[PDB]
């Protein structure tokens, strides 16, 4: 027999392909498995594995975050890419021109982007416009801003906000949460 | 598709090691040795034959 | 339908065969087989007879004659692997033999050509045979093994 320093028959723990049954989704997974293979530029290889991401791992990139990345120096002419959904932010009262390419836009972020003389794109047209990825910005939305991640790792002195039904007085503020009743934490 | 051992199957032994041909044609496996006259000095032999 | 269908079907195309690297190369007989050598047939019709080797045919068989005047074994193809070669020779140089081939022996009573050449060859052999005493009696007799005989010991 063989003496193994590792565990045998052990998968890599990655998405080889989406779990979605969506048909039009798999047409992009089909389009970027082709470009990732034959186009030698890493951009295609980045967008591919971003089409396999689950929902929780795809937070939406608001149309305000898109305006920061344009204020970022030299990037005002780039074509921002979002694999995910673009959402509207009206808290910004001005928006640049530029371009955006994403899977899904919300109806609000479609107007706002079109409103300024800019343009909304899909991913397929980006592959046709820039197969290699010339002059693009990928942007991810914040992952740890979720409501559940707020609860991850609860335990003494970690400040993790216990999972609880009702918030207010009289619900788990008393013994162990303050020095006067018992101890603190 | 299948591994052809050298050390048998002379044709694969000749793609590896292009020197295998001129090795044998000149022998060099059976190559003879120059002759020497040196003898062990009488101290070395005295030690070896000792009690 | 009693069975739906497979949705891709295998093609009835046949691929040709990869070029094989093998070549017909002439058999190298074992060193005990020399033209004009008493042979001992180990199997077949004539198993046990003691016959005289003549020529090595193109099909790798061996051409033998009894002679038919002696032990009653005609000119016949025999496989070199079923035949014990012996240590006693007859002089075969008096025989043409150039007329033979494998095509001659094809199957495709006995034809009158094969009876002519049967006797033509013995004129040369039966001359040489009687020269050593008993070799006419010897080429006529059948071999056997006896109680106590050990083929790994005995010489042939």
């Amino acid at each position: 027999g063989i003496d193994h320093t590792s565990k045998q028959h052990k998968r890599s723990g990655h998405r080889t392909a989406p779990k979605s049954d969506n048909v039009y989704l798999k047409l992009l997974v089909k389009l970027y498995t082709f470009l990732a293979r034959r186009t030698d530029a890493p951009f295609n290889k980045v967008v591919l594995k971003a089409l396999f991401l689950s929902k929780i791992n795809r937070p939406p990139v608001s149309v305000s975050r898109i305006a920061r990345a344009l204020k970022q120096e030299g990037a005002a002419n780039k074509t921002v890419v979002v694999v995910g959904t673009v959402t509207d932010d009206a808290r910004i009262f001005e928006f640049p021109k530029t371009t955006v390419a994403a899977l899904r836009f919300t109806a609000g972020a479609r107007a706002k982007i079109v409103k300024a003389g800019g343009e909304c794109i899909t991913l397929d047209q980006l592959a046709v416009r820039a197969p290699k990825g010339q002059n693009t910005l990928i942007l991810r939305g914040p992952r740890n801003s979720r409501e559940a991640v707020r609860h991850f790792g609860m335990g003494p002195h970690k400040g993790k906000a216990p999972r609880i039904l009702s918030t207010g007085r009289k619900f788990e503020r008393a013994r162990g949460r303050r020095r006067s009743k018992g101890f603190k934490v | 598709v299948l591994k052809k051992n050298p050390l048998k199957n002379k044709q694969v032994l000749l793609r590896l090691n292009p020197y295998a041909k001129v090795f044998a044609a000149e022998k060099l496996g059976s190559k003879k040795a120059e002759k020497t006259g040196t003898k062990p000095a009488a101290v070395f032999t005295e030690t070896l034959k000792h009690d | 339908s009693a069975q739906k269908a497979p949705k891709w079907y295998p093609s009835e195309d046949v691929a040709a065969l990869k070029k094989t690297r093998k070549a017909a190369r002439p058999q190298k007989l074992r060193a005990s087989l020399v033209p004009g050598t008493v042979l001992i047939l180990l199997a077949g019709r004539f198993r046990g007879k003691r016959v005289v080797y003549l020529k090595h045919l193109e099909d790798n068989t061996l051409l033998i004659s009894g002679p038919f005047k002696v032990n009653g074994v005609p000119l016949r193809r025999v496989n070199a692997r079923y035949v014990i070669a012996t240590s006693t020779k007859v002089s075969v140089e008096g025989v043409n033999v150039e007329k033979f081939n494998v095509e001659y022996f094809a199957k495709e009573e006995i034809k009158a050509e094969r009876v002519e050449d049967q006797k033509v060859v013995d004129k040369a052999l039966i001359a040489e045979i009687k020269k050593t005493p008993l070799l006419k009696q010897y080429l006529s007799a059948s071999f056997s093994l006896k109680n106590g005989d050990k083929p790994h010991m005995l010489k042939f």
């Binding site: - | 051992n5 590896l16 292009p18 020197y19 001129v22 062990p40 101290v43 | -």
Partner: protein, 222 residues
């Protein structure tokens, strides 16, 4: 298209040079070995004629073979064997001998049999059992492009250059010796000798340092 025709005898010329350079370069490794084995002979002779003695240079390379099964091994040796890449019974690789690697062997001696390989066995193993490690994948050598596309950065552009870097224990011994997948041997052809393997070679078993007697055991296993 030019293609097939005009790039053939253009390429086929470069093929001619690789083995024309392997031609001259191996000739130099054969004259190098023989005059070294001769000077070690002439030195023991020139000394005995001076009434003196001649101590050999110590052996800079060993070949280790794993003699024991895969279980009931204490933790400390079991970690060493895995650092020499001895993952099964009867396998083995070449080990450079320094003070660092030499106190490892003292830990695993009950579990291995090792010695000093001659140029004979280094040449048989590599030709017969020698494989490369290419993107893992344990490739058989069989060709000079498998060695040149991997070790060519170091030189070592033929299989005659491996055997040289291995036996001279040259600078690149670590790169080259890790480019060889561990040698998978068979059991000894004529048996092991002795009734019982797991005594030390000095008490009549198979393990420990058997020195130049390893050349004979490996060949029955090759």
């Amino acid at each position: 298209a030019e293609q097939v025709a005009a790039e053939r005898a253009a390429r086929k010329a470069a093929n001619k040079e690789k083995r024309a350079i392997i031609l001259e370069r191996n000739a130099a490794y054969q004259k190098e070995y023989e005059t070294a084995e001769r000077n070690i002979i002439q030195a023991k002779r020139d000394a005995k004629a001076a009434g003196s003695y001649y101590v050999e240079a110590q052996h800079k390379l060993v070949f280790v073979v794993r003699i024991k099964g895969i279980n009931k091994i204490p933790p400390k040796p079991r970690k060493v064997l895995q650092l020499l890449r001895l993952t099964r019974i009867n396998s083995g690789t070449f080990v450079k001998v320094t003070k660092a690697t030499l106190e490892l062997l003292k830990l695993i001696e009950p579990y291995v049999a090792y010695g000093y390989p001659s140029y004979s066995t280094i040449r048989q193993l590599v030709y017969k059992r020698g494989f490369g490690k290419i993107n893992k994948q344990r490739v058989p050598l069989s060709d000079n492009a498998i060695i040149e596309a991997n070790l060519g950065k170091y030189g070592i552009l033929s299989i005659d250059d491996l055997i040289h870097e291995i036996i001279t224990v040259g600078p690149h011994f670590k790169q080259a010796n890790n480019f060889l997948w561990p040698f998978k041997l068979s059991n000894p052809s004529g048996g092991w000798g002795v009734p019982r393997k797991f005594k030390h070679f000095i008490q009549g078993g198979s393990f420990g340092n058997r020195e130049e007697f390893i050349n004979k055991l490996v060949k029955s296993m090759n």
